[model samples]
Target chain A: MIIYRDLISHDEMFSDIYKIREIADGLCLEVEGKMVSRTEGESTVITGVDIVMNHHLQETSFTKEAYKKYIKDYMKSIKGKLEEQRPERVKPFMTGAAEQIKHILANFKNYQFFIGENMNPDGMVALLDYREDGVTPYMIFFKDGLEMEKCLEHHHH
Target chain B: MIIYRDLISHDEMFSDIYKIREIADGLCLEVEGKMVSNASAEGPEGEGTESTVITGVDIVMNHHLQETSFTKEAYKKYIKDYMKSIKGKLEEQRPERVKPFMTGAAEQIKHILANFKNYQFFIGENMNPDGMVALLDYREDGVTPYMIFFKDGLEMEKCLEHHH
Candidate 1:
């Protein structure tokens, strides 16, 4: 989930196009496949069914009728926000890299993922190692397989 | 005068404030300097009355250095594509304009060619419509420079790095 979320646009919330539904009077901002509430510098995102439900009211007062009314009032405040958070910035590099990353991740989940800071900033670079504690890269996916080579050379001691 | 037009943004233009003037023929466009017919795309672009050859119409025709803004990363990438596109067009010359750009890269330039058989590396931020590039080898000694110029006709300046 984190891998997919990391690839998605941080510039716009709706661009994620996650599930937005009213469940038991609770609002969830589902990121990727899981309901998530992340905190950015100035923004505090609150989502997740149980977390939001418990946070909105008390355990003792939890009821189906009460939940319905809570959801009704919650939708009123959120209807305006969904419309407001629709501005999108087209990030071609990030978008292209995401498609490439998705392909590699689906087939090969053995190795971990690494995010690039230079050359392909915020782009994904996957690592593959067959030997134990092997620092030398055998195969890299981006920049014609030279992406991670330079990535390794960038900090080779 | 960074002809960084159509590459950057107006938001950053506030940093490189140009001009907003109307010429004798009655046409006003935003330029990057005072009312002067200076070839901003060519040079002498800045504040102070850099009067190249002032006539309202003449100034309008020349004061064209004012451009939009761009990110540093995009600027570097943009330069690379321009050089590659022009590589086939320019004719190779024995090398004369390699003075300042190639002048700096004199020492290890031979070794450079051995590694990069392509001999094409674009560096530096200074470029004119004649369109030139300099490759810099960063080292403990200092940065060495190499110039590859694309001029009229097929005047080409192949990299001295690959002259081996």
Candidate 2:
């Protein structure tokens, strides 16, 4: 899942990642999925691996490695300066508006997902799709659950 | 960015009630921040909870302001009479051609000039009365752009109130 934030909570964010892994591990354990171990010098790495992919992720495959090691690597990043919430330099006059829009979008996204609109993992990612067309011009969002396919249309004129 | 629409009455089509928050900010005016929906779902009877963002807007400065810092005090100064002129412009722009009616997909676009400009949002799903989703499209037909409704999964337009 893609996380869209407005510098709200690193605590919640990190906790969420842990929870996802825990659930993944639990599910894998249910099928008696084997846990493998590999050596990382004196310390050892023990974990499970699974492959997941999506068109939105724009990746062929993303392997879910051992949670413990993932957490460790994540910890290493935290040891360094994180991309903390601070003033961002957008267009010359758009800084304020951009920041506001970001906040607005986060608020809108956090709003309840329509009744059955978001049951799939694919529904989790909603990114802007900017359009260059003049007639049917401008940006729209994608990755929300409901399947949107262009069907036959009449002028309705 | 997303403009959600309905087969609204003629009078209600022009509600810029969302205009209260629409203000000018120097050269780069921050009018409204709308949601952008990805993927276009089209059809004649297409209607329902359509999702899409409204983009591309023209700003008529109160006098002549652009890409400049703004203060609360100045916003009022610019938009007051600015609104008056707008009313005049609309009065001049109205024509019979802009009337709403049924179209190709066989959906009707109710024609009315109301406070639709600041039109804000779409709350629930378009539980299509007859298994149809009335997708609204911004026609840009006249002074006050007219919108057309589509069949299930057609499209929806919106004018949000929130601003930056």
Candidate 3:
């Protein structure tokens, strides 16, 4: 079963919330159906299940629309950079590239979005990629304010 | 004067330490010799110099690094992924920043393999308020250890220090 943890306050500008539950061999700290952290030990890993269920609470003023806009703008900016740096690579996918990316984002099933300090450090967000098993993509959007920093894709294999 | 902040700990394997100080009207978080995070605001005067240190030990501890065999296969995958992320970001977002580093990166990797007698890899954060850092330690070279720094989830700098 899925469980919700309380929000943890780091400072005036940042905080975190965790969703945790039990698994076959250990406990998993999860966000948006993706594992944030996992623990398996000598014990059945079930021993740590109780410890993972605690929750905290924090405050935030973010919306999915804002996240969408941030992603869109970043994708557009990066596309321009790609054209400059790798003209050959960008040549084939030049036509309607922006729209294509948006389409992929819009249609991705099991879309899970987290803001302000989930699994990452402060000033970041985690967007769960359900297409691939156990791969969660992350990017930096707002840190301390409404400013965008950089877009990144974090992968685990 | 310079101040250092112990930002977070990723278990016994690794931890992050950041050096920061007040500059003019804002703040800067520095590592080695580069500024990783910086901020400024509109204010009338300078703020006082009492420093604050924030530590998030448990968060990183939750993510563990398992032991693995040290082989070229391991090294190749790690380096390839690292390069892809950096080049992708630089080529798309910051062309100016890409040229200087890209020119030297391949050569450095080649040198690392040629002289590679033994090495260790560790995963940790860069203490930048965003993203992580991958650390490599080569037991036989002058530039034995290297840090790949990431900010806002993008690669900012790959640092190597020379010691006598």
Please give, for residues A98-144, the per-residue lDDT of candidate 2 as tens digits. Answer: 34334435544322121112223222222221123422211112111
Name the regions of candidate 3 deviating beyond 4 angstroms. Answer: A1-157, B1-70, B124-133, B136-164
Q: Candidate 2 regions off by >4 Å?
A: A1-55, A60-83, A86-157, B1-164
- List model 3 lDDT by residue over A1-157, tens digit each: 1112112212111112223332212211233322222222231211111122222112233355765676555445544555765555354334444444465467545444444334322332333344354443322112112221121222236
When sorted by lDDT, best at the front, the candidate numbers are: 3, 1, 2
lDDT of 2 by residue, B71-153 (tens): 33543343343333333433555332122211211111112112223222121132222211111223222122122222111
lDDT of each: 0.27, 0.23, 0.33
> How does candidate 3 score on lDDT?
0.33
> Evaluated with lDDT, which candidate comes out highest?
3
Per-residue lDDT of A52 in model 2? 10
- By summed lDDT, which 10 consecutive residues of candidate 3 chain B come out lowest? B28-37
As a whole number from 0 to 100, the lDDT of residue B164 in candidate 2 is 12
Worst 10-residue lDDT window for candidate 1 chain B reads B7-16
Write down the worst ten-residue block by lDDT for model 3 chain A: A43-52
* Ranking of models by DockQ: 2, 3, 1
How far does residue A133 in candidate 3 sit from its true spot (Å)? Answer: 43
lDDT-best of 1 and 3: 3
